[PDB]
Amino acid sequence: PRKMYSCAFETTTKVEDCRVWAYGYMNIEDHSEYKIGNSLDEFMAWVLKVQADLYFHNLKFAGAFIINWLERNGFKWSADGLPNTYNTIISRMGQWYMIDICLGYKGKRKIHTVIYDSLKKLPFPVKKIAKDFKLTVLKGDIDYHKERPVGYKITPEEYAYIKNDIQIIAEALLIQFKQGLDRMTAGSDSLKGFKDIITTKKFKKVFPTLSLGLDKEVRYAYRGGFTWLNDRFKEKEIGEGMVFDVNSLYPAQMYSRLLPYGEPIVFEGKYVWDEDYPLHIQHIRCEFELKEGYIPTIQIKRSRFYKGNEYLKSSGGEIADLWLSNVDLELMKEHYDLYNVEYISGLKFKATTGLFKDFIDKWTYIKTTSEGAIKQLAKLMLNSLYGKFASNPDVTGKVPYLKENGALGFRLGEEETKDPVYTPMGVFITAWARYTTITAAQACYDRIIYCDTDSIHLTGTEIPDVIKDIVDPKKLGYWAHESTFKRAKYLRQKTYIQDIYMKEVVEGSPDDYTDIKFSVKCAGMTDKIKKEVTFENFKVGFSRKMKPKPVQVPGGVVLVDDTFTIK
DNA sequence: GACTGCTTAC
DNA sequence: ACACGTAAGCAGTC
Numbered sequence: 135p136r137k138m139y140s141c142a143f144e145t146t147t148k149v150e151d152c153r154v155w156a157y158g159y160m161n162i163e164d165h166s167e168y169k170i171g172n173s174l175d176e177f178m179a180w181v182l183k184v185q186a187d188l189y190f191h192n193l194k195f196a197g198a199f200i201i202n203w204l205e206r207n208g209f210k211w212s213a214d215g216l217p218n219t220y221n222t223i224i225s226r227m228g229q230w231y232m233i234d235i236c237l238g239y240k241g242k243r244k245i246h247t248v249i250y251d252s253l254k255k256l257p258f259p260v261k262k263i264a265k266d267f268k269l270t271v272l273k274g275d276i277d278y279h280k281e282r283p284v285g286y287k288i289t290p291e292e293y294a295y296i297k298n299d300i301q302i303i304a305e306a307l308l309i310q311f312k313q314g315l316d317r318m319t320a321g322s323d324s325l326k327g328f329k330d331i332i333t334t335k336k337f338k339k340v341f342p343t344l345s346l347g348l349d350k351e352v353r354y355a356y357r358g359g360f361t362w363l364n365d366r367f368k369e370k371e372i373g374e375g376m377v378f379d380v381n382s383l384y385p386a387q388m389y390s391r392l393l394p395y396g397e398p399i400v401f402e403g404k405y406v407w408d409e410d411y412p413l414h415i416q417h418i419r420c421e422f423e424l425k426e427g428y429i430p431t432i433q434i435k436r437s438r439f440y441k442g443n444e445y446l447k448s449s450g451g452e453i454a455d456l457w458l459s460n461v462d463l464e465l466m467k468e469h470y471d472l473y474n475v476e477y478i479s480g481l482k483f484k485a486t487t488g489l490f491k492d493f494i495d496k497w498t499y500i501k502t503t504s505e506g507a508i509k510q511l512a513k514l515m516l517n518s519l520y521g522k523f524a525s526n527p528d529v530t531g532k533v534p535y536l537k538e539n540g541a542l543g544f545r546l547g548e549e550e551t552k553d554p555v556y557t558p559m560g561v562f563i564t565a566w567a568r569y570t571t572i573t574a575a576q577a578c579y580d581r582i583i584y585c586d587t588d589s590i591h592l593t594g595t596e597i598p599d600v601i602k603d604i605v606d607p608k609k610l611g612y613w614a615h616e617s618t619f620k621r622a623k624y625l626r627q628k629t630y631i632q633d634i635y636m637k638e639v640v641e642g643s644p645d646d647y648t649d650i651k652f653s654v655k656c657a658g659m660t661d662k663i664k665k666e667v668t669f670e671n672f673k674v675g676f677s678r679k680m681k682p683k684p685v686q687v688p689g690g691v692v693l694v695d696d697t698f699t700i701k
Numbered sequence: 702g703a704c705t706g707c708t709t710a711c
Numbered sequence: 712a713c714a715c716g717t718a719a720g721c722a723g724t725c
């Protein structure tokens with residue numbers, strides 16, 4: 135059995151002088167076996183000898199320093215596991231999962247140390263993990279702005295902080311390990327846990343591995359959340375209003391909607407109703423016009439004729455070439471007049487409900503009876519199961535290298551593909567979610583300001599009748615009354631501000647409130663820049679050079695300030 | 702445009 | 712083989 139260590143670095147912040155000044159490691163199963171020191175050389179000597187599993191919190195950061203050292207001390211990158219090489223799992227999106235450092239083989243047994251990201255299991259800051267896992271946490275922080283020359287000696291206080299940090303993570307990881315949550319990521323524990331419940335034999339039967347060609351066809355119909363701002367309210371100062379948000383929307387669809395399973399049947403032309411294959415994806419070419427009084431529902435991506443984020447009123451004289459689930463197509467027919475519809479071909483599926491019951495019951499109970507990180511973890515188990523079913527087969531990743539200037543660079547690796555999980559489930563989970571949210575928005579047409587995926591933002595403070603019997607703060611698939619606001623302003627998708635009514639005892643109301651809480655929502659905008667925002671300055675053209683940007687420099691990674699501009 | 706390489710809102 | 716998802720976005724290179 136391989137030993138497991140919780141590890142951390144403390145690093146300098148200068149582009150011209152980027153290095154580790156402190157490191158710590160601690161045996162997760164024996165806290166007495168730990169060590170803190172001021173030399174990366176000393177840490178990496180231990181790394182190469184220990185032949186164990188290491189965890190850093192935010193491997194993307196520490197990993198840069200580790201790979202900088204490896205490239206300087208005779209290691210090259212290799213997928214083959216050759217002596218004096220290292221392998222990585224770094225995704226196309228720049229997510230770090232693994233560094234596997236190989237010293238060679240004794241016979242057929244690999245001599246290696248593997249380094250994982252604890253952030254993939256526990257995606258919270260260390261102090262938040264301590265608070266919600268109820269672990270010991272020291273008050274205060276290391277001063278990162280302090281000058282620290284090579285050989286700088288670690289103070290007793292700094293020592294205690296490093297030791298605390300690695301112990302918090304060690305303790306939290308062990309809590310999860312002893313629960314059987316032992317995979318390298320939350321998502322991986324999620325899919326495995328679901329397979330444990332239904333059995334692997336049943337998984338294979340009910341969710342067969344589709345061919346890459348068929349999977350690709352299915353994925354044409356795979357889309358995400360309905361995120362939409364009503365033109366009527368775009369960039370206007372709004373008065374009183376409210377937000378409702380579905381409790382676990384996608385898991386609620388998984389729980390109760392008609393969903394596909396098994397091998398699809400290919401058909402040509404228009405789908406013909408088949409009660410045993412009641413779900414389908416249809417390939418069409420058509421033109422369309424939005425019906426008066428209906429919310430637009432069609433957005434077209436990867437087309438030279440359309441803005442991909444724009445919900446379309448009209449096909450505008452071009453032919454829309456679409457692969458659509460039956461859920462989407464019926465919603466399209468409800469909201470649009472369709473013209474010159476060419477039904478080309480498609481795929482039909484067997485379907486049933488309840489395939490995720492026990493799994494959803496388990497994690498919902500945990501979600502409903504927990505708070506903070508624990509609640510958020512339960513939420514992630516539910517949502518990552520959906521994600522795992524729609525896992526892209528393309529697992530091509532990034533290959534690190536040391537460039538001439540001594541900083542790490544990356545190149546796109548060789549094409550790698552893995553088996554599809556079950557992409558039709560992904561297609562229909564999101565289609566039903568879109569249906570749920572859009573049906574509610576449409577029933578609130580007179581008051582609807584904005585939707586993002588599973589929310590409705592409404593003018594006025596009275597609960598609409600369409601959801602009045604299904605408002606609840608926790609219950610699966612019910613609408614939580616998220617907030618009531620005194621005023622708001624919506625510039626564009628995922629970009630809005632609200633003055634929310636609050637009460638001290640939490641969410642408040644126009645009659646009973648003690649405080650007004652200014653809330654900024656803006657995709658891309660980081661926390662310090664949000665603190666700059668006011669009702670007055672929140673507008674297209676707003677810009678602040680205060681967005682931290684991680685930059686590869688010689689020795690590792692530093693944060694430098696970049697701009698964020700509302701363009 | 703494609704691409705790299707980051708963010709937050711779901 | 713390991714490795715949850717789309718969406719909307721900003722700031723760059725070539």
Ligand SMILES: Nc1nc2c(ncn2[C@H]2C[C@H](O)[C@@H](COP(=O)(O)OP(=O)(O)OP(=O)(O)O)O2)c(=O)[nH]1
Pocket residue numbers: 379380381382383384385513514517518520521587588711715716
């Ligand atoms: N695959 C995946 N989907 C997510 C994730 N976060 C949100 N989503 C999708 C699925 C969610 O049901 C949906 C709406 O997000 P919310 O933030 O409202 O979470 P949800 O509604 O699940 O729970 P809550 O509203 O917190 O009770 O967006 C994620 O981390 N992974």
Ligand SMILES: [Mg+2]
Pocket residue numbers: 379380586587588589711
């Ligand atoms: Mg939501």
Ligand SMILES: [Mn+2]
Pocket residue numbers: 379380381382383588
């Ligand atoms: Mn929700």
